[PDB]
Amino acid sequence: PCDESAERAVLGSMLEDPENIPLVLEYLKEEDFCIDEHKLLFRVLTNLWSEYGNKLDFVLIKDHLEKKNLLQIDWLEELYEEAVSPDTLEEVCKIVKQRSAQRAIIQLGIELIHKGKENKDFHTLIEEAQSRIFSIAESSTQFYHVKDVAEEVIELIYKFKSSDRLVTGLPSGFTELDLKTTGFHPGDLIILAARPGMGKTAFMLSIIYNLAKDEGKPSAVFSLEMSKEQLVMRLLSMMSEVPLFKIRSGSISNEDLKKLEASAIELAKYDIYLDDTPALTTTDLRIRARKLRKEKEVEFVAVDYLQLLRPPVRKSPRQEEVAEVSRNLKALAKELRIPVMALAQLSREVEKRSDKRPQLADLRESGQIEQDADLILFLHRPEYYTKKPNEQGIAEVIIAKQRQGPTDIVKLAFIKEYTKFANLE
Amino acid sequence: PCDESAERAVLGSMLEDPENIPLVLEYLKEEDFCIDEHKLLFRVLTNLWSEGNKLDFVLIKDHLEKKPIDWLEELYEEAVSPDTLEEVCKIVKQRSAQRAIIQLGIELIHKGKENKDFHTLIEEAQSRIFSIAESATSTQFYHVKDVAEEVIELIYKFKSSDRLVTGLPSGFTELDLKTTGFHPGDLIILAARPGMGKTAFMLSIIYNLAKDEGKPSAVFSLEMSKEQLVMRLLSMMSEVPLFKIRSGSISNEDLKKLEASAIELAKYDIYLDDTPALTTTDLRIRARKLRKEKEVEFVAVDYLQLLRPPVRKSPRQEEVAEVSRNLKALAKELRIPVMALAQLSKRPQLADLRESGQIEQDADLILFLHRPEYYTPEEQGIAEVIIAKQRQGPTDIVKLAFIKEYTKFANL
Amino acid sequence: PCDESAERAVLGSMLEDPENIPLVLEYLKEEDFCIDEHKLLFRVLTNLWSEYGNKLDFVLIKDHLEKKNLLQIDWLEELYEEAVSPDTLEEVCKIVKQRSAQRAIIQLGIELIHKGKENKDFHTLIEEAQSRIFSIAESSTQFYHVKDVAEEVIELIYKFKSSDRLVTGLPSGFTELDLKTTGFHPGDLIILAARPGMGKTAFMLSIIYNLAKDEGKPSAVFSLEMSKEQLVMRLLSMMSEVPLFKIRSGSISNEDLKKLEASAIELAKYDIYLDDTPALTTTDLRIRARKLRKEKEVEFVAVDYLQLLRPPVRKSPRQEEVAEVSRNLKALAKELRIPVMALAQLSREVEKRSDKRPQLADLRESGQIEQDADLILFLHRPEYYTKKPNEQGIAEVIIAKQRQGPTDIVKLAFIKEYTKFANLE
Amino acid sequence: PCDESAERAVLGSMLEDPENIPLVLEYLKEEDFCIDEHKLLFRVLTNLWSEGNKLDFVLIKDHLEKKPIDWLEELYEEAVSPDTLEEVCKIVKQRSAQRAIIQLGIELIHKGKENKDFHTLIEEAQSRIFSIAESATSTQFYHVKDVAEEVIELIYKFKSSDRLVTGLPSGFTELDLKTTGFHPGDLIILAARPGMGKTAFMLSIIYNLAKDEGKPSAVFSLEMSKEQLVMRLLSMMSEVPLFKIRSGSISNEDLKKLEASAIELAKYDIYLDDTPALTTTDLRIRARKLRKEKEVEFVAVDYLQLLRPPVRKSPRQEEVAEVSRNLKALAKELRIPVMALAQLSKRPQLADLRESGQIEQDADLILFLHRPEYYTPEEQGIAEVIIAKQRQGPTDIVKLAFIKEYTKFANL
């Protein structure tokens, strides 16, 4: 009817890292604990976290205990030992919650029988039972009346009205796309989806370069696909307009080198953070993105690419794993209050159709990703298909999903040599 | 917890006077009696009314001929005054109500004892608590006599009402004409290709419902944020295009319109929950509470494929079909119409929907949306609402106006 | 090697509700219990249930304990507390049985080694081992010789011979179908299967109406699809011949109302019980059907419809769940000793064939339902398909499975307006 | 538990006289000896018989040339009288039998210790107990010499028998002619579309088997009740149509015929189990006991798809194929022919059966039933039995008569 070993880890994980506390607070409340010992500890830490926030210590906790007189400590240290990982922490919180809910239900049953054996009004008992089951149901996210939501929406309209910006939110750097898309707003998820070799990795690089150079803003990229050196080397080729194949092959002119050196200096000026760790769990990416957001102030985060990410617990069907990863990414974007852009790859059936450009259906094949991506961009290169079209050297960016406006298409220039996207005229 | 003597006196009093029996029949029924012998005598006495009204001891014998005469005569000796009787009838009912509660208590303990996801346990616990609260009896079967009378009263109400529609109106006159309306306990499915304006059509329905019918509604938006959704509706009301809103391109004339729309919308009662992925069980639990607390007469879910079952099924279609069944069960339980939106992979037809996991079989009403201008020609400003399935019978089509910029539906 | 917590619940569940005892008796025997304490309790209750049957109390049990002197009681009350649900009861009985069987096997092994170390005849030991494993195997349903079965069959033939009935068993109300089908016999499962909108819900209503009116017999319907009000409202339309669409729309003439009122009076005369609970588990339906059979005496039960029912434990493939539900329904029909009729829906592929009528294969698509349904009926409306056939207003009932006779087809009249089936001429 | 000296004397006695060795060879074999040295000397001595019959010490040396001579001479000194020898041979065998039992005991403990469904544990426990009981030795391998002699004896029995059929006859002469018959340890599959009379054909087989061959049979009827099935057979015997039986339409002349058929059927030994859904493991356990207790020489299962494996498999075909393998294993273990009926989704052919989960590969014999009148013409009263697969080789077809009303099969 209860599990202590579980509660032990919940309290312990809260002791070692304070940040863990809120996470537990979302999952649990003081009274899912069977032990009064634990309910007190849950209470004091819950209060302590708000007052001291992140910098909560063990000596500081001890001093607070002494002032209260609540304390009489080795046990606390033992609990600290018992600390468990964030993923396991979520797991043990869940099992604690289920036991608690089970206890609560059985208790209601016991009471109703007792009340029933005694003589009381039927209406009173059932209404209270309704209230009690409602309370158990509440213990999480609730319903919102339109009046409260309306007030926040109006405030958002005010901020848009009061802005001096041609494009609200972070600009992409590509004028026609940037105008019709209205930009990248804080807390939304953007999806750049294209077939392999369509230049989405390059497009990401163009975006982050344009952001750092023109807007003077820092960005972060998790590159699961290519190493940080390859990413930077490609970027230098984009800046200096020295062909990438020559750089990698090792054939360069002294004049070409000086151009590359200068490009390196200018790039060093810009603030850009790279993580090339090959396969990250959503939990891993979340942790890294959190701290990177705190230490460095990043207004944009790119993940390349989506399919390379994996859930903390693997499932058998592929689609559920993707859909889960997507759902987390959107959750992260909101949490960080910055735009998050995830890249995605398209399956073979895209090119089996006579149109040869991407469609919404092609993305579905990967899962129910679309449901919460606030903007969806496709990349297409007809040229990719063959030599012949006299068109070539051009690439088209399709705007499959917008919250603001209708479906539209934007044509831009793409130079295969330097792997650089540029505005047409 | 029942009394043989307290109710036993009810039977005696019924034997003595045949005018006593309708009085007890009003207060209590056969199920409330603890003893089979009392229930049986209660049964025959109630049935005695139809087919001699006042023969007080020889129809008793007559009933015995087709079916303890000394014993009932002993019961005859035990009887009480009519003022006495109402009191003892009340105590018989409460003891019966007591049993129902105790039974519920035992069941609730059992549920806790079982092994299920706690959400499931909470969901199943709510259903039993609500059913017993409504019925006052553990048993859910109803004799047709009781149902028939209630139906007749309902028929009176339908006749005496000025139609329009006996069910909840969409706000669109012609569609509302072909459909009886949205009745309590049925599932309505709005299915269309992406960008056909089904999300907007839902907003139009709930808005028209709130303003004209003064009725509360609930929307579960799995796709777009509660904030995102609301701006939409404000855009529909004030007729200011979303692109202008966001761009910062708007003017003061635009604003005040948006503010007024915000005030007007705040007047209406509409509840929103945006949870990115809901299980059907979560949704019923939440809708369960929302129906009790705020009394919402309509529920919209956007959209269907975003929902998932408590236990995952294979591969897809069965999982989606499972969701449909759950929503239907929700509509039945909450006794309100529930509308779920669905996405589709010339016009659209039923076959296209079947590829999506065969929802058509569990649905009481199916609506499609089609916008010929979206495919792109010929002069047009219109979008058509198709009815694939109606419990009544015929498939029919309703045109309506659609404004691309405001994403607003209107009667022609 | 054993589980007490399990045995605790088995005894407890028997204490609170006597009816639970036989269920346990089917699953378990006195000696699957590791505790002598439990074996005594199992023994006394097993004996007690037969003598007192359903009305077995706690004071009465205590008095019996005292007369025996077996008793010396708080523990018994604690056991009563420990009572578990019917579904869980089945689950814990299973785990008790497995431990018991495991113990039994290991014991045989121990003995054989002991016997082996000692000097005994090989033939004697192995034969006894064969006997012992046979006993474990027995502890459930056995083989029946044809001689015993023949005697019961002959008795059934006698009852058919000695009957004054044109149709033995419950009549359907439709003369041609009723004659060739020979009727609905006690303890068999009938399946009415048709595509959505083919009028099976209406056909059920016709059957139950005809039963109550003509034969003066009570019936029960579990309507998972439509509410009790909708079901009754439709039925009133069938009786009064007032079109259903007018009733629901609210357009009626005072003359039409009086007809409806009279129909309500006549319907109130008939005994029909309705349960509109939306999704029932097989366990739920079984419990309700049991008590409804005991309190009210119902000779017919209809379930509309099959796919809406669900097993106590959900499985991943759909077909296994259906097949399980079917299997339970047949088991219920036998148990209740009354005919049980379940309605089933047919998938899209029925109308993808040029014949456009249902076939046995169409039903298979839903699972191995057919294996035990004692009669299978299909409904077909060619008219449903289009206006044109000059035929219309007619519906055909196909007799796919019969135990008595060959495959046959019966044509009947169907009025779309009133949603009523009627005999043709 | 063996004795070096007790058996050691057996070896000595074999050294002394070459007429002693066939006496011990009759009682015991090489496996019964505890020591490798004894087994090896036993081996060479047994093989010494074929290729000098009576050289008592120099073939010993001869065997040593191609392969402890002082030691065996010590064994030579230890020997005993021929009456003595039979006794010590008996004790060697029993100690050996002892070991087999103890080994079985250890294994049985292990099985209990493992984690499986208890039915599985009981099934696996039975198989080991039966094999050791039959073999008297833990090991199941047999040298071909022993098998060859048994085969030869069997060949004698086949030759000296008046055929007809060396295997179990169906009752239908021409079919029985083309098939050797139903032999012990093989799987026969009767596959046909619904209503082709495969259930009836089975009843005809088991009836003809019981009446003429005086042999017991077992049927697992998963589809129809034991009562339902039996009436059928009574209908077949008395030639009274089922529709008349049930309708109450029958006459006294009909009855007595049914009663006589009931008496005649009661004379025959036939065992029925109707369990709606059986696992294959349950079926073997039950058939295991039924074969031992009542000694049934034939088993029929109606029908195949209704069976299910101990562990569920995906999606379907593999699950069904698994069932086939299990039944084959059952036929092998019980050493009797096992016949399973199957349903099919011009004539019917092997391809149609393969769609059903590829049973053809595990089956020793495959029979199809076809009734051209059922499809409906031309004058006809006949149904054909097709052989798709025979271990011998050729596919062939056998006509037979079929009476629609009695559902009865007969020779033309």
Ligand SMILES: Nc1ncnc2c1ncn2[C@@H]1O[C@H](COP(=O)(O)OP(=O)(O)O)[C@@H](O)[C@H]1O
């Ligand atoms: N190292 C390289 N050398 C030469 N051309 C390249 C190189 N990398 C990419 N390209 C060209 O430019 C495009 C770059 O796209 P890429 O970076 O592969 O995006 P994605 O990750 O979507 O495949 C490719 O289509 C290819 O034609």
Ligand SMILES: Nc1ncnc2c1ncn2[C@@H]1O[C@H](COP(=O)(O)OP(=O)(O)O)[C@@H](O)[C@H]1O
């Ligand atoms: N500013 C605009 N100009 C033109 N069309 C627009 C504008 N804003 C929205 N739309 C159109 O309105 C439609 C909204 O449909 P929506 O309700 O989102 O459909 P669904 O519910 O299927 O997602 C989109 O198809 C979009 O093309």
Ligand SMILES: Nc1ncnc2c1ncn2[C@@H]1O[C@H](COP(=O)(O)OP(=O)(O)O)[C@@H](O)[C@H]1O
């Ligand atoms: N409320 C109604 N109003 C008008 N016609 C109806 C109504 N309900 C059913 N019908 C007609 O009569 C038939 C009733 O069948 P229905 O009750 O839907 O059985 P099922 O459950 O098999 O679909 C339908 O085919 C339809 O044409």
Ligand SMILES: Nc1ncnc2c1ncn2[C@@H]1O[C@H](COP(=O)(O)OP(=O)(O)O)[C@@H](O)[C@H]1O
């Ligand atoms: N009274 C009857 N009149 C005509 N045909 C009948 C009668 N009774 C049974 N039959 C036929 O006999 C056949 C019985 O076949 P059956 O052994 O059940 O086949 P299966 O084993 O494939 O189920 C059915 O096809 C049925 O049509």
Ligand SMILES: [Mg+2]
């Ligand atoms: Mg890439």
Ligand SMILES: [Mg+2]
């Ligand atoms: Mg939408």
Ligand SMILES: [Mg+2]
């Ligand atoms: Mg229906």
Ligand SMILES: [Mg+2]
């Ligand atoms: Mg059959």
Ligand SMILES: [Sr+2]
């Ligand atoms: Sr109290």
Ligand SMILES: [Sr+2]
């Ligand atoms: Sr001993």
